[PDB]
Amino acid sequence: MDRPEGSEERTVQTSNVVLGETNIESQDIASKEYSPTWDRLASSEVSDEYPMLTDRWLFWKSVKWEVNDSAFGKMLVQEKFPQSWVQMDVNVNNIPRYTNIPNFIPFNIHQYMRADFEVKIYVNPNDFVSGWLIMAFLYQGSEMFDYKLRRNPAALMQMPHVLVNVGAANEATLKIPYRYVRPFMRCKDILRGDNLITGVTEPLNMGVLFVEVLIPFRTSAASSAPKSLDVSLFVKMTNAKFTGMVDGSIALLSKPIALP
Amino acid sequence: MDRPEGSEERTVQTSNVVLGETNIESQDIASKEYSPTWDRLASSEVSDEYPMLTDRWLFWKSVKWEVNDSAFGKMLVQEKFPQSWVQMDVNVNNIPRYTNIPNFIPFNIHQYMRADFEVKIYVNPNDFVSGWLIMAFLYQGSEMFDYKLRRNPAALMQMPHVLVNVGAANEATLKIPYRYVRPFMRCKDILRGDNLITGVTEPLNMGVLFVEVLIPFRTSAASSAPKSLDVSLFVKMTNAKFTGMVDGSIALLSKPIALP
Amino acid sequence: MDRPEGSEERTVQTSNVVLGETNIESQDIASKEYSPTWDRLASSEVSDEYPMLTDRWLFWKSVKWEVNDSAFGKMLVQEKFPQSWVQMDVNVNNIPRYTNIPNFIPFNIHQYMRADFEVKIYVNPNDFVSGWLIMAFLYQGSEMFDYKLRRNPAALMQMPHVLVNVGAANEATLKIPYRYVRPFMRCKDILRGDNLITGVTEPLNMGVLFVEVLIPFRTSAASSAPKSLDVSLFVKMTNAKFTGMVDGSIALLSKPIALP
Amino acid sequence: MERTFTPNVMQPTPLLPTTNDGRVTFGEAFNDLKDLARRYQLYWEGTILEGNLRAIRRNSALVQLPLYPHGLRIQPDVNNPIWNIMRDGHIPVISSGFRYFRGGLRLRIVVEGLNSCVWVQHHPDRPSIFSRPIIGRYIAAKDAYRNHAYAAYVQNMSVNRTIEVEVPFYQPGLYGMLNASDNNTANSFDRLRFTGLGDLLIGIEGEQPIPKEGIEISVYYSIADDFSFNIFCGFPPMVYCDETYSAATPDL
Amino acid sequence: MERTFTPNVMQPTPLLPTTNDGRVTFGEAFNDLKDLARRYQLYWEGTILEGNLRAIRRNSALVQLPLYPHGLRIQPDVNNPIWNIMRDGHIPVISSGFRYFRGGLRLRIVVEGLNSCVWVQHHPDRPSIFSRPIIGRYIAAKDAYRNHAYAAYVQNMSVNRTIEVEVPFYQPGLYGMLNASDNNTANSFDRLRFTGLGDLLIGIEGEQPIPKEGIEISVYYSIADDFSFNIFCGFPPMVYCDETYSAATPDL
Amino acid sequence: MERTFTPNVMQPTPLLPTTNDGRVTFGEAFNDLKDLARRYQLYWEGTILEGNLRAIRRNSALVQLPLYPHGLRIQPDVNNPIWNIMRDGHIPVISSGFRYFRGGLRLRIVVEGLNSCVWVQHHPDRPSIFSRPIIGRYIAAKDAYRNHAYAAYVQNMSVNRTIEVEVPFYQPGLYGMLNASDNNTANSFDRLRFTGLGDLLIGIEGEQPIPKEGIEISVYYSIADDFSFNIFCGFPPMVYCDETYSAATPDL
């Protein structure tokens, strides 16, 4: 700190949202970036795009990790992505709704959807702590026969990830291009099987986002030293396309099934 | 600190005085800068100038502000400017004298005087405190009918001012161009009225310099942590002109009347 | 610290050794640098050179200085140079041997030797201590009639030296060009006198290397604050030449006589 | 420069398109306080009865009026509803943000109830050191009667009951002080001759008696064309007009 | 990019001169895992007796074989020494590091002990949701008998006891899932039609009886030319083959 | 370079205009210590009586004088007032700041009281390992008598009582050591042949008796033209001459 103002804070703007950062980031990209071509073969209805709504950096969860619950491999976040994020606005009964968040408002009236994603992880520690986080992404991981084994931080180091050095207080961004078995994901619980058929698919489960402890959070032994630290996430969409226009209530949203 | 010497210290030289600074300043100018033209219409005697004496950065007051006397709007300094500065050398009876300070030695032999001023405020805190000062100037403020009401820091924010962030330890310079009802100020108590007339004027009262608490000085609760901080002021003159040569004792200096 | 990695660490490579530094150094050169010409007049046998062995930065001593033994002029190091360094590998009886260290392996088979030297001094303090070291060199100092008087830090300030500011944690390099009474130094104890003659010469005693306390090491009074600090030395050779090939055991190494 | 210093700007949207200070929507622009200060406002107003004047009224003055760009010190009372709830006009509010000035003022004297003649003089070398006017028999002889050689205007009420004059700046210095205090002993000279434009005296010239209701004199004023509000210092703290008469009784 | 991020490099020596992935010392290069995945390995192998088939064997199927690029879920037992100590081949090990794929597979069916004729069909629209094969009389009628219109190959053992076929990629989506779980209810659709190439059925066509030793069917497989291991996610944790049978008994 | 390192300079005034090391005010320059070292100073001085010499004086030596650029180790006593209060000359003070040298010295022997002849020899291969001279009958035979083939000069006192010689540098090495210790056993070779220019012997050649007052020999010395003070190491700590005889007795 050498100025009347503290110092210069870098700025990142998208739509009508402005994010400030002060340090050098840790970055990675889940897969090769590309422009889709086979999505046009999936739907004859024109794909609508709402960039001012979807390209907006939106605030996700805050998760609080303490010294007493910070062990190697501790999962601060284990969420189906982008399902958990898009469905983060629930009612009294933990039933999601796409009706209040402007970024998610197109999900309510469309049956099929696709986009690339970016995730920012913000931690604001003081000058006197030490620790390390790893945020990683696994494409459709929950469907793999060894999913729980891939949860170990040693395994996360090999999938696309970014690191947060609490000793440096760096921000971090993880780019996640769209890759799925189909050129579109489903927004809601539709086309389940019948008496004989079982075609069941989760809405918006492109993969699993992890946030885990690489090196446990440590603090001064002093009493008035913060033994806690909040971890905040931000998400946005790059190439958001929506198709299959429907009434917002033609299909329902179920209570989401959690991960182990 | 990354060198054998600490790091590079910026330097500012004037006459035979050299000031060192280490941080980025907070600056402001009381009014538009200009070159005077109507001062020549006031005196037919040639205006003498003593740049090596007057253009010299001179040390003013040190004022000590503590945690226990640091409240919002606390006045560390409330002084008539430049009167208080030029008259800072007093005798046993608090009577000023222009005879010892080389910068003020022209004031003793001249009746009328004019100059632009610059004020530097130096605070040297450690790395572990927090607080904020505001140094502001009010042109001929004491003569205003609402002067005491303009003393609040909320009012100071609107007059020309500079800020000192104790958390950054920045220096600060306030430029104050000469503006007065007359093209000259008086150096001493002269031409008071008589039995019928009352023409009474204070020497060198171009305005009021404030130094106030914007955000109270705070410290670690530890015992051996400094609960005090000195605030030092420096002043110099830009376009010092003097006219009306007189004997150094033809006119006397009174004990200065203080502000409320 | 503003990056995921801490920050950039400068690197210095020689042979197969790589040294890392993070701060701006303190440097000096014992005497004017030159290319030797009269060494060729001393030996008709071709002078062998082993740059990959000798030009290698080698680790010397670590010396531990504590708060309770850190007084003005305290000698952390007082060693004959380069004797003490080249002979740092001793046996059970404190007898040196040139047979294990690759940098010193040419000293075992040659009778006469010459080179320029460079010495690095590494101290890695935390952010909260204060103190100062001086590392200085005195050409053939032990042979001077006032050697012990030149041991005072006030006297060291006048000989070639470098400084280590514990408050800045800077590295430091002292270059020491070869200067001696003869164009070669002796590797071992050879050609001592006989019954009548006394021609006795110490191996490799080009001078005395000092490391002394300029300003005593000070620490926080807290219990868990390190009251100790290690000082490590590194040495290498620039123009190493060896001549006078002999069997590695034709001449013996004595137990080295220490300095007062 | 700290007063306008804006570091680390975070702006979610672009700026709002201009209307040229109202010129696009309304037919006129609003960009300068100087323009508003040229719209007349009440300076002083009072009623004068025969009892307020000298026993023998030898064409003596009715009002001794000090001239301040920042207006007079207002007295809010039951007899003065305007000053009580409207408080100070726009010009005193504008003036409060500036230290100095150098121009003239434009006045408008409205005299109702008198069938006689009114004389008006400007005394630039005699400005008052108080921020309140002096009425009738309390006016000293030196001012109570028409002085010679001063810039003046004499108007019969039979032709027009409104007098229009412009008062010039005749001060020996660089600036005139705005917002000056009446409690000033350390700088009497500044307060005496470097503050006010000089008193304006309004008197009567005739033998006609004043009606029992009295005459009313209303002086409006505004800034002249050569006037300038000069050095911007802070605004002083303000009072709110909606805190005079409450909306708890919306009609009263 | 963090996965390959190497800050503050400290390198004592220069790099080691190349051999072009072995081409200098040996006559061939080794730079791509795709090449190794094109070297055949065991997919499944079993012995079938008359008792495993339907009582009346009306040219019914012998094996219903699910087709996974990452291979079947191995069962290490006393009867299967290979899976017990060799464990999974190279292809399942390679496959474990990638999420998706889009190509075909190449098979080789070796049938020993049977003098009759063998028929082979590929059912791309009917892939199994389990990672284990179905044998003989446990195969449902819909698959136990030759279906029409499917891509097939019929081979007499008298001419050759080895069948060579290439199974194509006929899936409605972009990718097929590698390393898929058999416990999958939340995404049945993915597991049903976006995972396996479709079952391969191997049956017998003739009236010849099966010898008391039974017939043995060995299916080898490899990656086809149009195949791609697509998105590199992490490797899962591994087991070590030298921890099956110990070297404490160096010969056993 | 740390020895001359001057960071963060703060200089209130400009530099002082030059005089070219005194050449402007006085007629000469003073910029090099080498020039001062070329101004002669006392090296050694003593009185010799018949009793100090051999019983039978066979043209034997009077003084065996070691030659050091940094001078002899002084002995301050009541008989030697100079060394006691003037201490060491300028040359020993200059020499103390340098480690090495490589040149010759210029001597001046002044012999008073003797009417005979004086012989002087230089023994470059025989320099003393002590910093003190040897007198008369204490001089070993090898040096007490004139040796052959050495550079010499023989002077009759009848023609001139002052001898002027220049002693050359005849050493086998690169440098000669300045400020060498007499307590040196670990490096005897350095102290023996790489320190001093070689002894200078001053003897008498005639049968004339020495007066009862004795003869006095005064040797002055200075640096030669080919001399160099070579490597600047620190200065050693000093003593102050005004702390020998106090000013408490201003005349004594």
Q: Where are the domains of chain C?
A: 1-260
Nearest partner of B184 among B248, B111, B246, judged by Cα: B111
Which residues in D131-142 are b (16+ Cβ under 10 Å) and which e? bebbbbeebeee
Chain B: closest CA distance from residue A8 (Å): 12
- At C50 the three-state DSSP class reads coil
C92: helix, strand or coil: coil
Q: Is E106 exposed, middle or buried (0-12, 13-18, 19+ CB in 10 A)?
A: middle
Overall size of chain A counted in residues: 260
- CA F85/CA F240 separation, integer angstroms: 9
Q: Is there an interface between A and C (3+ Cβ pairs < 8 A)?
A: yes
Peptide bond into B82 cis (omega under 30): yes
Q: Can you tell me the distance from the alpha carbon of B25 to that of E43, in angstroms, rounded to the nearest whole number?
A: 75
C6 vs A168: CB contact, 8 Å cut-off?
A: yes
Provide CATH code, domain C1-260.
2.60.120.20
Residue A244 region by backbone torsions, left for phi larger than 0, else alpha for psi between -120 and 50, else beta:
left
Residue B126: count other Cβ atoms within 10 Å of its Cβ: 12
Pairing assessment for the beta strands C172-176 and C26-29 based on DSSP bridges: parallel
Most distant CA pair in chain B, distance: 72
| Angle, vertex CA B128, rays to CA B122 and CA B131, nearest 5 | 55
DSSP state of D84: H
Q: How far is CA F170 from CA F72, F119, F146, in A?
A: 20, 21, 19
Rg (CA), chain E: 21
Interchain contact, B5 vs F11, CB within 8 Å: no
Residue D33, φ and ψ in degrees, nearest 5: -65, -25
The answer to whether the CB atoms of C146 and F179 lie below 8 A apart is yes
Query: Measuring CA to CA, which residue among B227, B19, B3, B234 is closest to residue B126?
Result: B227
Chains D and C touch (3+ CB pairs under 8 A): no
The torsion defined by the Cα of C178, C181, C187 and C191, in degrees rounded to 10, comes to 170
First-to-final CA distance of chain B: 45
Helix (H) or strand (E) holding A52: helix A51-54
Please state, in angstroms and rounded to a whole number, the distance separating the CA atoms of residues D153 and D108: 12
Distance CA(F194)–CA(B111), nearest Å, equals 80
Interface touch A140/E190, C-beta < 8 Å = yes
Residue D139, C-beta contacts closer than 8 angstroms, at least 6 positions apart: D60, D61, D64, D201
Taking the alpha carbons of A74, A80, A83, A89 in that order, is the dihedral positive or negative? negative
Q: Is B161 on the interface with D (CB under 8 A)?
A: yes
Nearest to A8 among D2, D8, D10 (CB): D8
What is the 8-class DSSP label of residue B248? T
In sequence order, which ranges of chain F are alpha helices (DSSP H)?
A: 33-36, 81-85, 90-95, 141-144, 188-193
Compare CB distances from D234 to B150, B182, B205 and report the shortest one's residue.
B150
Task: Report the DSSP beta bridge partners of residue D63.
Answer: D135, D202
- Contact B257/B76 with Cβ under 8 angstroms? no
Lookup result for tokens 């640091």: B70
* Chains linked to E by 3 or more Cβ pairs within 8 Å: A, C
Are D174 and B190 in contact by the 8 Å Cβ rule? The answer is no
Whether residues C17 and E12 touch (CB distance < 8 A) is answered with yes
Q: Considering only CA atoms, which of F126, F104, F120, F105 is closest in space to residue F43?
A: F105
CA distances to C119, F48, F143, F214 from F58, in Å: 60, 16, 13, 18
Question: How far is Cα F53 from Cα F217, in angstroms, rounded to an integer?
Answer: 14
Q: How far is CA B209 from CA B135, D209, F241, in A?
A: 7, 57, 59
| Structure determination method | X-ray
Pick from F113, F216, F121: nearest CA to F157 = F113
Which strands, in side-by-side order, build the sheet including C58-66? C26-29, C172-176, C117-123, C228-237, C58-66
* Chain A residues with beta carbon closer than 8 angstroms to that of E96: 146
Question: Residues A97-102: contacts with CB within 8 Å, 24+ apart?
Answer: A97/A253, A98/A187, A98/A248, A98/A253, A99/A248, A101/A58, A102/A53, A102/A56
Q: How far is CA E53 from CA B238, E102, E110, E141, E163, in A?
A: 112, 35, 19, 12, 21
Q: Per-residue DSSP letters for C167-184? A: TTT--EEEEE----SSSS
Dihedral-angle region of residue A180 (phi above 0 means left; psi in -120 to 50 means alpha; beta otherwise) = beta
DSSP state of B41: G
Chain B residue with minimal CA distance to F5? Answer: B5
Q: How would you classify residue E157: left for phi > 0, otherwise alpha for psi between -120 and 50, otherwise beta? A: alpha
**A5: contact with D, CB 8 A cutoff:** yes
Q: How many Å apart are CA D229 and CA D213, to the nearest integer?
A: 40
- Could you tell me if B143 and B257 are in contact, meaning their C-beta atoms sit under 8 angstroms apart? no
Which residues fall within 8 angstroms of residue C138, CB to CB, at 6 or more apart?
C144, C147, C150, C159, C207, C208, C210, F233, F234
Token pair 């801490």 is found at: C6
Pairwise CA distance, residues E142 & E192, whole Å: 17
Output b/e per residue, A1-13; b: 16+ Cβ within 10 A.
Answer: eeebbeeeeeeee
Count of C-beta atoms within a 10 Å radius of residue A197:
12
Q: Which residues of A touch B (CB under 8 A)?
A: 1-6
Termini Cα distance of chain A: 45
Q: Identify the CA nearest to C168 among candidates C219, C211, C125.
A: C125
Tally of CB atoms within 10 A around E10: 11
Q: Are E2 and A173 in contact (CB under 8 A)?
A: no
Do F96 and F70 meet the contact criterion of CB atoms below 8 Å apart? yes
CA E172, E174, E178, E184 dihedral sign is: negative
Nearest chain E Cα distance for residue A194, angstroms:
13
Measure Cα distances from E96 to A209, D113, E40 in Å: 19, 107, 17
- The C-alpha atoms of residue C163 and residue C26 are separated, in whole angstroms, by 6
- In B44-68, which positions are buried (b, 16+ CB within 10 angstroms) versus exposed (e)? eeebeebeebbbbbbebbeeebebe
DSSP E47-110: EE-GGGS-SS-SS-EEEEE---TT-PPP--BTTBHHHHHT-S-HHHHHHTTBSEE---EEEEEE
- Token output for B230: 């000195």
Distance CA D233, CA F202 (A): 96
User: D113's torsion region: left (phi>0), alpha (psi -120 to 50) or beta?
Assistant: left
Name the closest residue on chain B to residue F11, using Cα atoms: B18
Q: What single DSSP character describes residue D136? A: G
Q: For residue B74, give the DSSP letter.
A: -
3-state secondary structure of A82: strand
Does E have 3 or more CB contacts under 8 Å with F? no
> Are residues C157 and F236 in contact, defined by beta-carbon separation less than 8 angstroms?
no
Structure tokens at D106: 């434009």
Q: Which chains touch C (3 or more CB pairs under 8 A)?
A: A, B, E, F
How does DSSP classify residue D83?
A: H
User: Which of D3, D5, D180 lies closest to B143 in CB terms?
Assistant: D180
* Cis before C160 (ω within 30): no
Chain E contact present for C11, CB below 8 A: yes
Strand partners, A243: A112
Q: How far is CA F212 from CA C37, C90, F56, in A?
A: 57, 65, 17
Closest CA to E175 of E92, E66, E98: E98
In this complex, which of F5, F8, F11 lies closest to B8 when CB atoms are compared?
F8
Query: Residue C112 contacts by C-beta under 8 Å, 6 or more apart in sequence?
Result: C42, C43, C184, C185, C186, C187, C242, C243, C244
**Interface contact flag, E187 A152, Cβ < 8 Å:** no
Which residues are registered as beta bridge partners of A82? Answer: A205
Nearest to residue B17, comparing CAs of B240, B176, B234, B231?
Answer: B234
Cβ–Cβ contact D8 with A under 8 A: yes
The strands making up B228-237's β-sheet, listed across from edge to edge, are B26-29, B172-176, B117-123, B228-237, B58-66
Shortest distance, CA E1 to any CA of chain C (angstroms):
12
Q: Which residues contact A102 (CB under 8 A, 6 or more apart)?
A: A53, A56
Q: Which residue has the tokens 């009964």?
A: A93
Q: Read off the DSSP letter of residue C252.
A: P
- Residue tagged 């006017």 (tokens): D133
Instruction: Give CA torsion, residues E171, E177, E181, E182, to 10 deg.
Output: 10
Measure the CA–CA gap between D152 and D200, rounded to whole angstroms: 10
- Tell me the sheet residues that pair with B161: B136
Distance CA C212, CA F234 (A): 15
Interface contacts B/F by beta carbons within 8 Å:
21
Cis peptide leading into residue F124 (ω within 30°): no
Interface check A168 vs E, CB under 8 A: no
Strand partners, A128: none
Cβ pair B146, D236 in contact under 8 A: yes
Q: Which amino acid is at D157?
A: M
Cβ A29–E1 below 8 Å, yes or no? yes
- The b-or-e profile of A82-99 (16+ CB within 10 A means b, else e) is bbbbbbbeeeeeeebebe
Cβ-count burial C148-164 (b if 16+ within 10 Å, e if not):
eebbebebbebbbbbbb
Count of H helices and E strands in chain F? 5, 11
Q: Which residue blocks in chain E are alpha helix, DSSP H?
A: 33-36, 81-85, 90-95, 141-144, 188-193
Q: What contacts A26, CB < 8 A, 6 or more positions away?
A: A162, A163, A164, A165, A170, A171, A172, A173, C4, E2, E5
Of C59, C48, C51, C65, residue with least CA distance to C15:
C51
**Tokens 């062995």 found at:** C53
Closest CA to E196 of E97, E90, E125, E250: E125
Residue B122's closest CA among B79, B61, B176? B61
- CA A151, A153, A154, A157 dihedral sign is positive
Give the CA angle between residues F85, F88, F93 to the nearest 5°.
135
Give Cβ neighbours of residue E75 (< 8 Å, ≥ 6 apart): E83, E132
Contact C189, C252 (CB under 8 A): yes
Q: What share of chain F is helix, strand, coil (3-state, %, to 5)?
A: 15, 25, 60
Nearest to B209 by CA among B132, B118, B131: B118
Residues of E in contact with C11 (CB under 8 A): 8-10
CB contact under 8 A, A201 and E189: yes
Residues recorded for chain F: 252
State which amino acid sits at residue E173: G
Q: Which residues of C touch A134 (CB under 8 A)?
A: none
Q: Which of B9, B13, B17 sits opposite F8 (nearest CB)?
A: B9
Residues of B in contact with C172 (CB under 8 A): 4
Q: In C, which residues are within 8 Å of F234 by CB distance? A: 138, 150, 155-159
Residues of C with CB under 8 A from a CB of B: 22-26, 163-165, 167-170, 172
- Best CA proximity match to B176, nearest among B115, B118, B120: B118
Reported residue count of chain B is 260
Per-residue CA distances from C176 to A158, C28, C241, F8 (Å):
49, 8, 16, 27
- Contact residues, chain B to chain A, C-beta under 8 Å: 22-26, 163-165, 167-170, 172
Rounded Cα–Cα distance for residues F148 and F126 (Å):
14
Give the strand order in the sheet containing B75-82. B75-82, B205-218, B130-139, B161-165
How far is D87 from D76, CA to CA, in rounded Å? 8
Distance, CA of C159 to CA of C138 (rounded, Å): 7
Pair D92, D162: CB distance under 8 Å: no
Q: Determine what percent of chain D falls in helix, strand and coil, rounding each to the nearest 5.
A: 15, 25, 60
Q: Which two tokens stand for residue A206?
A: 């492109």
- Residue C248's CB is within 10 A of a number of other CB atoms, namely 14
Contact C217, C189 (CB under 8 A): no
Give the other-Cβ count within 10 Å of E25's Cβ: 7
Contacts of B161 in chain D (CB under 8 A): 2-3
Residues 14-73 of A with CB under 8 A from E: 26-29, 31, 38
F12 and B5: CB-CB below 8 Å? no
